[PDB]
Design a protein around this ligand. Structure first.
Ligand SMILES: Nc1ncnc2c1ncn2[C@@H]1O[C@H](CSCC[C@H](N)C(=O)O)[C@@H](O)[C@H]1O
Ligand SMILES: Oc1cc(-c2ccc(F)cc2)cc2nccnc12
Ligand SMILES: [Cl-]
Ligand SMILES: [Mg+2]
Length: 213
């Protein structure tokens, strides 16, 4: 089996169904003690929690689901009726994420889209009945942050005030995206310094609020 399957099995063996906090703790324990994995982690997760609570988004899009850690993190803090869409290109990870959210009891708040963000983003308005997004969490391959941001704009999915929150802007880094949003009059940017998941290595999140065309 794979690392991702081992994470899911550990959660099933150690966490409580319907208890998102126990799911997050089980994942963080496994990934601290057994095998490192690219979950956003508790340090950056706490910053995400604070941002989610501040903005109270009705509709959030996540790019990159992996095992569902960040989806559980965000979905547990959404207000009643608010929703998360998450895109995952790896079908095995899409299935693991669905099962993780099922285990956590958050399945009615989340839709997991199996496919590449660049193929799914253009279908959000027609197939998934999206008008505009309130928040986007970018946490997929780093070379897609800028192209997908530009694609979201082209597709009419951003509104004045849409909050982009980008993981890993220091490590591994996303140089084109970070330079672009910080240089653009269409974004108001703030940097939140933190640490790489499960490591004593500096990382950070960038918040970039869309200002319109
Ligand atoms: N173009 C794309 N569209 C959708 N998912 C993508 C993608 N490129 C990479 N990915 C996925 O992005 C994930 C990065 S890891 C995501 C971690 C997750 N947000 C968490 O914190 O828990 C991987 O599972 C990878 O398969
Ligand atoms: O949070 C992350 C961390 C890393 C990563 C990998 C290897 C290192 F050495 C350091 C950091 C990669 C990621 N890819 C996609 C989404 N999130 C990632
Ligand atoms: Cl951490
Ligand atoms: Mg990340």
């Amino acid at each position: 089996d794979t690392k991702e399957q081992r994470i899911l099995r550990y959660v099933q063996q150690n966490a409580k169904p319907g208890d998102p906090q126990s799911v997050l703790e089980a994942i963080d324990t496994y990934c601290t003690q057994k095998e490192w994995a690219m979950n956003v982690g508790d340090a950056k997760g706490q910053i995400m929690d604070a941002v989610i609570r501040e903005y109270s988004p009705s509709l959030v899009l996540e790019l990159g689901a992996y095992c569902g850690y960040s989806a559980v993190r965000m979905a547990r803090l959404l207000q009643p009726g608010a929703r998360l869409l998450t895109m995952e290109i790896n079908p095995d990870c899409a299935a693991i994420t669905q099962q993780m959210l099922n285990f956590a009891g958050l399945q009615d708040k989340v839709t997991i889209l199996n496919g590449a963000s660049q193929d799914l983003i253009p279908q959000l308005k027609k197939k998934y009945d999206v008008d505009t997004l309130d928040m986007v969490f970018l946490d997929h391959w780093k070379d897609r942050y800028l192209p997908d941001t530009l694609l979201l704009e082209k597709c009419g999915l951003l509104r004045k005030g849409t909050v982009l929150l980008a993981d890993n802007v220091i490590v591994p880094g996303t140089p084109d995206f970070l330079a672009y949003v910080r240089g653009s009059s269409s974004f108001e940017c703030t940097h939140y310094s933190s640490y790489l998941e499960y490591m004593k290595v500096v990382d950070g999140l960038e918040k970039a609020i869309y200002q319109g065309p």
